[PDB]
Design a protein around this ligand. Structure first.
Ligand SMILES: O=C(c1ccc(-n2nnc3cccnc32)cc1)N(c1ncccc1Cl)[C@@H]1CCCNC1
Ligand SMILES: [Mg+2]
Ligand SMILES: [Mg+2]
Ligand SMILES: [Mg+2]
Ligand SMILES: [Mg+2]
Ligand SMILES: [Mg+2]
Lengths: 147, 157, 187, 103
RNA sequence: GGCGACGUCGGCUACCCACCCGACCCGUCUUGAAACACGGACCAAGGAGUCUAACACGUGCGCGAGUCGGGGGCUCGCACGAAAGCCGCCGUGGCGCAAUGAAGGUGAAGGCCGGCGCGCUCGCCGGCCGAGGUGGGAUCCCGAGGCCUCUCCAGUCCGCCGAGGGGCACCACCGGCCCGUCUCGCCCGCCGCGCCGGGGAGGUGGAGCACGAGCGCACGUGUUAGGACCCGAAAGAUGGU
RNA sequence: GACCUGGGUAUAGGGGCGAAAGACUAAUCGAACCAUCUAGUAGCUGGUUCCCUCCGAAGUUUCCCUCAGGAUAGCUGGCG
RNA sequence: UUUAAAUGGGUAAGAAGCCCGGCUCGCUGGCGUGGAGCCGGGGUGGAAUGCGAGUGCCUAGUGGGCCACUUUUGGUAAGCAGAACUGGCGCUGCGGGAUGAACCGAACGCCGGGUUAAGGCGCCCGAUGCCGACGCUCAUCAGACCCCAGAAAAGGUGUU
RNA sequence: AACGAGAUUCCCACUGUCCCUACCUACUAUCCAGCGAAACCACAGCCAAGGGAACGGGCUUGGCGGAAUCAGCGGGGAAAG
RNA sequence: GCAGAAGGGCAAAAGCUCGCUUGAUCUUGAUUUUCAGUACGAAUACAGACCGUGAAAGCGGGGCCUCACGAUCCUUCUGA
RNA sequence: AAUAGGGAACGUGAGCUGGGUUUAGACCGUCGUGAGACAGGUUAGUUUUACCCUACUGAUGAUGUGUUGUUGCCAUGGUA
């Protein structure tokens, strides 16, 4: 919309919104990130602290498939199955606990997050944290590991 | 231009005044500073170890922190267009108790108790303070004598 | 001449929404009738929240709503929120509370209506309680956005906590000088 | 050139890029050019199945994907050896063969 | 209440003329321009903040812990149709839902009750539950009392209500949890008893947690990269006459 | 006469040729002309197109091969 | 530099305040000490005047300044160079200063009536065309109104 | 020595270089018939003094101010390039 | 007199002489000064080790105080 | 008689002149490794336009007098 913008409203006025004195030219501070240590230094600290220097180890040819592990923590853990499972789990027959395997839901590690409910589970993950597996072993559940 | 040094314009104000040089009086150290004590800062010149700066000399703050030989004081500093709650560690020789609230602390003590004297006696004492009112229509007396006629003296060098 | 003031005489609030939603435009006509005529302060807050933006009407989940209605006293009231109702996956069972909102989401009004509660709009709110009697007008967490963790002093001032605008998180992205005392300094 | 709290950015436009520009204006025109290259390839052949031969069950590599099953390339002569069909007979039966595949 | 006919009545403009008063020529840089500063004889038409990418915030819309087909695919051969429509075992993927460390890696729930071990500065079993606490806090709830054509008896209502209560968002503060490091320390575990795993208590570093708010689209402002609002060098290079 | 000239011929651009003046090399020479790279760059000039309403500045701080310029704070407006 | 102003600078002028009761501490340590913290209870009218505040985001222009009181530095001085405080000009017309950036009044939507400020009132030129008051002054270079635009030491039996 | 369209000083002769200008001729200029540009140009075109970006044509207060022109002229327009 | 340029400070002393010593060590934060309220530098108050001195309270983590100094990248040594 | 002192954009270059300084050639001295430098000396070196407006100088003429001629008068300006 050329209609709705500042240049139709600013036509008739001499310096076109840029000033008689400063008189906007082309590149008065340099192009891009020029002078980032010299005359734009006060901009690069106070808004980008950390911008200059070596900080770690180089790793040539990383592959973003070796380090792939998604996480689900325990509040998002009962939504991996139906709600028809957990209502069927607790209605007083025996200690029949359902499976919840995060690997066919696309997760590899199970982290901790409070309020796992009172039912027992058997949870088949590739990895666990120790906060996660002791919430499971305190609701009467079990923690079975898969490769 | 102007040599931005610590202890710069204090040729006179970080000095002992006159004929009060020498070693310090010992009741300077036997003062009791608790949290929220209102203290004011007057840096001496004999103890070098904890004098604040030349910006707090003559100002007044409030104790938030107490340690073995010094006291943390939160003061306000006028920097250009805003004032800043600033907190400085100052040794105990450089401060004293501000008596600025001590004339308020009497008239909260003898004001609360005089409030409950009007509840047993039944009146409207009007315990709030007023400024100096315009003078009452009084009555002057020139008993015996008559007033003195004075006139401007001539000019002589 | 009268003074030397540097004018703030034009107050800068909203007297109408900037939306052209003709169904919100009739709620405004209903509630600014009820604002200037029923003599209540419930209907003035609800009238000025309908003028607000999409940011100033943040969503409200299902487990802030039932958490602020487990309180003493709230046992039979209605939760009015000017804004949308979502549902936590975190919550397991839902009580039979009575809600009243612009735009409940689809899974939220299925789990509310399974438990036996009732969903309301601002039309049948006025027919129920014109004064707003027995109402808990709840709000959403308006500084819950991703934008407010970028707001503050500056990311490179002392203690600051202010989350710089980096284009990608990682090592070699704004982590070297000003961020550790070895490489240069640390703020 | 920078300003208040913003992003430090690297637009890769420091090279003469207006000559090497690619606009997708022929892209509906090529979608109906390869439908007509599928339709006139379906009716040209036979009642033989469209979209070509039978592909094998194949599992993906690389930890991130090794829990899924993908359509592969051929049938890995050992599998043709057990099933009993010959390696040069098989690709006119409609069966894809990838001899470099290992079981 | 009164006055007036075929040339008079009212009217004003980009009409003209006169008078009295006021009034230096515009644009432009500049502390300062009528300037003895510069550009401008006149008229006509052309003529200068665009578009793409990225990001930021504001606002509008749809869905919402998810969102998004953009790339493909399907639908008689249809002008408009290079449109629109659909897919979902086409959601691969993108961003979000989790942070932290150089890395190996690790990875965010507490309080009470009842008891016990030297209830030993430490803790243990079981229940109840469940995002802690303080100070403010719109709204709402309760509310003695108060307000009506004759008096004692009863009803809805409404306005006034000191006080009291549960307290939204949000702010300040205190506590808690997760990761990196530090100090001080004792205990537990066994696909195997070790230059092994795990735990503790205090302090600090983090773009964290503390019942999710994001995504897609559109518009506006801003900044940048591109010829980049328009025009402008003295140059440099390659190939030729 | 180390003379004057015609035509033919040779030398070509960081090269030519010069009894030397940085002279001449097609009205161009202290590095030709032609086309392109190329809309080369400019912290420096000049220009920058309709109306009304409302608000309304600054020439100062700190840093910069900084001093005709920027980054930064202040002053401003708009949205809430 | 003993002494030491005027102007100035800070703080305080209540409920976040005051009092009482109890309990945690691994700090402190003759001590039911000291100090912090936590819980509970009791009493709100606490200088004058004026006023609605609090809060966040986004953000342009600017980064040559100039003048006048008063205060001051260099300089013989300067419509000179450089500071302090406040007001102005720049960004601002209008009335007066003949004239004018900055002086004196006063700040401005478009008009009608009234009144004024600074400044004036022979005639240009609106208003003394008042029977204005009291004196001083004669110049062969009279004098005549902030900034502001012309004069000193010295001298006169010129007049008062 | 000889030679310099080389630089300089004096002397003789010679002369309008001069004292000090005058007169004559040709060609123009001038006027007419035909034919006919360009530079430049905010608007324009009389002064004094004042103030002003300190050196005005315009502004302020004064002096004043009659059409239309011709031949010249080099004070000015801080004239043009 | 206090190393030195000045000013402030100092008397059983901060000076002068003597006796032991290495706190001129190890480590985390906070704060002040310059200030944008960033950094270096300098400084202050602590806290935790390990020490020195003194009969002890204490004092000491350089110089009585105000000055005496230096990023990223790279090099080098040290540490588990 | 006297050879007083000054101003008018240090009056006066579309009035002249071009000796001086003050482009390019060249010589010498000093300075510089050098290219070159020198209010150090010397020598050679293009001075454009008026036809516009006003000022001035002359030349007609214009207004008024009914027309036209003759003879005059003096306001004013200059002035030896
Ligand atoms: O002809 C000219 C001539 C004269 C003036 C101009 N000007 N001046 N300003 C001017 C503005 C616009 C146009 N021309 C302009 C041009 C050239 N000559 C000449 N004179 C002096 C110096 C140089 C030269 Cl070449 C010759 C040379 C030989 C002898 N005869 C004269
Ligand atoms: Mg600008
Ligand atoms: Mg102008
Ligand atoms: Mg080249
Ligand atoms: Mg702008
Ligand atoms: Mg005054």
């Amino acid at each position: 919309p050329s209609r709705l913008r500042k240049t139709r409203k600013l036509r008739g006025h001499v310096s076109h919104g840029h000033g008689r004195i400063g008189k906007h030219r082309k590149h008065p501070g340099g192009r891009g990130n020029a002078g980032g240590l010299h005359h734009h230094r006060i901009n690069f600290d106070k808004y980008h602290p950390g911008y200059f220097g070596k900080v770690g180890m180089k790793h040539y040819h990383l592959k973003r498939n070796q380090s792939f592990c998604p996480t689900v923590n325990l509040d998002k853990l009962w939504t991996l199955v139906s709600e028809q499972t957990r209502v069927n789990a607790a209605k007083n027959k025996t200690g029949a606990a359902p499976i919840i395997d995060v690997v066919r839901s696309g997760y590899y590690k199970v982290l901790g997050k409070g309020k796992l409910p009172k039912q027992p589970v058997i949870v088949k993950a590739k990895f666990f944290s120790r906060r996660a597996e002791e919430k499971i072993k305190s609701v009467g559940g079990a923690c079975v590991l898969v490769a | 231009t102007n040599t931005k040094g610590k202890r710069r314009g204090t040729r006179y104000m970080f000095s002992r005044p006159f004929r009060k040089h020498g070693v310090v009086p010992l009741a300077t150290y036997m003062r009791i500073y608790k949290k929220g004590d209102i203290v004011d800062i007057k840096g001496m010149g004999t103890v070098q170890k904890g004098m604040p700066h030349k910006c707090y000399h003559g100002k007044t703050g409030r104790v938030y922190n107490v340690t073995q030989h010094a006291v943390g004081i939160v003061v306000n500093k006028q920097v250009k267009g805003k004032i800043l709650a600033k907190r400085i560690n100052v040794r105990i020789e450089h401060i004293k108790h501000s008596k600025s609230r001590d004339s308020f602390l009497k008239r909260v003590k003898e004001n609360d108790q005089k409030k409950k004297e009007a509840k047993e006696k039944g009146t409207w004492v009007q315990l709030k303070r007023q400024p100096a009112p315009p003078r009452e229509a009084h009555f002057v007396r020139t008993n015996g004598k008559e007033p003195e006629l004075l006139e401007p003296i001539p000019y002589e060098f | 001449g009268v003074d030397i003031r540097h004018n703030k005489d034009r107050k800068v609030r909203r007297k109408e929404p900037k939306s052209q939603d003709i169904y919100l435009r009739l709620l405004v006509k209903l509630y600014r009738f009820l604002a200037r005529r029923t003599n209540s302060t419930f209907n003035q807050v609800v009238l000025k929240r309908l003028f607000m933006s999409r940011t100033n009407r943040p969503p409200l989940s299902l487990s802030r709503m039932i958490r602020k209605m487990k309180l003493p006293g709230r046992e039979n009231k209605t939760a009015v929120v000017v804004g949308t109702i979502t549902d936590d996956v975190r919550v397991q069972e839902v009580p039979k509370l009575k809600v009243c909102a612009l735009r409940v989401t689809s899974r939220a009004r299925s789990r509310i209506l399974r438990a036996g509660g009732k969903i309301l709009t601002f039309d049948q709110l006025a027919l129920d309680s014109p004064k707003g009697c027995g109402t808990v007008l709840l709000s959403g967490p308006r500084k819950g956005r991703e934008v407010y963790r970028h707001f503050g002093k500056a990311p490179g001032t002392p203690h600051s906590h202010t989350k710089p605008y980096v284009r990608s998180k990682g090592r070699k992205f704004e982590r070297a000088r000003g961020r550790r005392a070895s490489r240069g300094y640390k703020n | 050139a920078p300003s208040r709290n913003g992003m430090v950015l690297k637009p890769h436009f420091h090279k003469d890029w207006q000559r090497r520009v690619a606009t997708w204006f022929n892209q509906p025109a090529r979608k109906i050019r390869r439908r007509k290259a599928r339709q006139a390839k379906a009716r040209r052949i036979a009642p033989r199945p469209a979209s070509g031969p039978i592909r094998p069950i194949v599992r993906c590599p690389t930890v991130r994907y090794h829990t899924k099953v993908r359509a592969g390339r051929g049938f890995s002569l050992e599998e043709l050896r057990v099933a009993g069909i010959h390696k040069k007979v098989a690709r006119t039966i409609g069966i894809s063969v990838d001899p470099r595949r290992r079981n």
